[PDB]
Structure formats: C-alpha cells, structure tokens
Ligand binder design. Structure first.
Ligand SMILES: N#Cc1cncc(COc2cc(OCc3cccc(-c4ccccc4F)c3Cl)ccc2CNCCO)c1
Lengths: 116, 116
C-alpha cells in the first residue's frame, strides 16, 4: 500500500523567482538512511541522485549546478523538497521524482515558467 | 554501488516476431520477494507493475494485455525479462524499466521494429 503523493500537479512560477517542489511520502516517525533512495529528473536530465545519504555532484547535469539542491532537513518530515534558485525558461517542463523507502513509487509534476 | 546493467541498448525486431528484453541486476545467491519491486514503461504507459510477487492486470495498459508478460522464472537468475508476443509498429519506441532490490536504479532501451 506504499503510494507517494504530490500536493499539486502544476507549479507556475516567474523567471528569476525561486521555486520549491514537493513529494510527500510515508515515514514511520523516524527515518533510515540505508533504506532511503531518492531521484529527480526532467527529460532524462540528472537533477538529484541521493543514495542513502550520498549526493554526487559530478553526476548531476551541467546546467543545474549552483541552483538545484534538495532540502536535506525536509526529508525528516517525510517530503522530498527540491529547490531551484533563479528559475529560467529552460527549466520549464515535466519533472519526474522517484523514491524508495520500504516500498517504491514515482510521480510527474508539470512546471510552467512566466516572465513579466 | 548498486547499479543495474542492460545487455544491449537497442533491440531491432521484425513485425509479428516475438521479442524479449532484459535488465540484469545483482542477486546475492538467493532471492527475496518482500524486497523486490519491478516496473516497466514506454512513454508513460504501464506495461508491468510487479510488487513483491503481484502483477495486477487492471493496472496494465489496455493496448498491452494479451501480449506483454514478464517472465517470472527469469527473476531467480537476476534478470527482469519482459516479453512481447506479436510485435507491432505501435510498440516501437523507448522502453524504461526500473527495479528496487536492496538498492535501486533505472535504464532506457531503444526499440525499433522492421517489416521486410
Ligand atoms: N545519464 C544518465 C542516467 C542513466 N540511467 C540512470 C540514471 C540514474 O540512475 C540512478 C537512479 C536512481 O534513482 C532511481 C529510483 C529511485 C527510487 C525509486 C525507484 C523505483 C524503482 C523501481 C520501481 C519504482 C521506483 F520508483 C528508482 Cl528507479 C538511483 C541510482 C541511480 C544510479 N545510476 C548509475 C548506475 O546505472 C542516470
């Protein structure tokens, strides 16, 4: 019965505005590193690769480096919160996340940028 | 480091010819159901959803029903072997898998159909 919910399927943020997107998963009070694996993607681009407490920076995509970080503290709560600072038009698209803690599931999130 | 290899990144099969595609993963002598979760996809279409020894048939896509089955015996060997019988042009495309047994990973496989 391990399913993983998103709050909202569509985020609509302006250019330059900092964004953060969420993926709520079940946690049994406390959290285990050896169990937890998290991943983020947008059109086959490595955004986050988090394996039991190991973000490798080389593996991340070149056009995401000083901007796309996952909030570490948020995972204690039971939420993979991916942050982007200084949003671009280029970042607009469909964002996959994948999570494995006990069970496993994934979800897609549409992201559409604006520009005044 | 739990990584999951494909033998070949491109399968080239004729129309009507039966196809089978592979995803080799590590197994530590014996295999555990409660651990293993497997999934198959092609352009956001549910092909297989296998959760600790549970294929649900309703969840599978409508245009895949009497054709796309995963070989159960093959998983003992350490290989998710997805079979399609009676291949169509419609089935040609990019096939995602993905697997969680101990660790987790995913891989894409290009599939290009022929007809002489
Ligand atoms: N360039 C490039 C490129 C090409 N291929 C793959 C990658 C990313 O490779 C990873 C992804 C990853 O997360 C996937 C994940 C997380 C949580 C649950 C599931 C998960 C599993 C099964 C069912 C449901 C699920 F939700 C999955 Cl599949 C973890 C580790 C790796 C390591 N990759 C290197 C070895 O192959 C990058």
């Amino acid at each position: 019965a391990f399913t993983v919910t998103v709050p909202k399927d569509l985020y609509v943020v302006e250019y330059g505005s900092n964004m953060t997107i969420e993926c709520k998963f079940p946690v049994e009070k406390q959290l285990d590193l050896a169990a937890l694996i998290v991943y983020w993607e947008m059109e086959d681009k490595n955004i986050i690769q988090f394996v039991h407490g190991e973000e490798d920076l080389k593996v991340q995509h070149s056009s995401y480096r000083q901007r796309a970080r996952l909030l570490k503290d948020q995972l204690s709560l039971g939420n993979a919160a991916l942050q982007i600072t200084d949003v671009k038009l280029q970042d607009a698209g469909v964002y996959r996340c994948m999570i494995s803690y006990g069970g496993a599931d994934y979800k897609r999130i549409t992201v559409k940028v604006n520009a005044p």
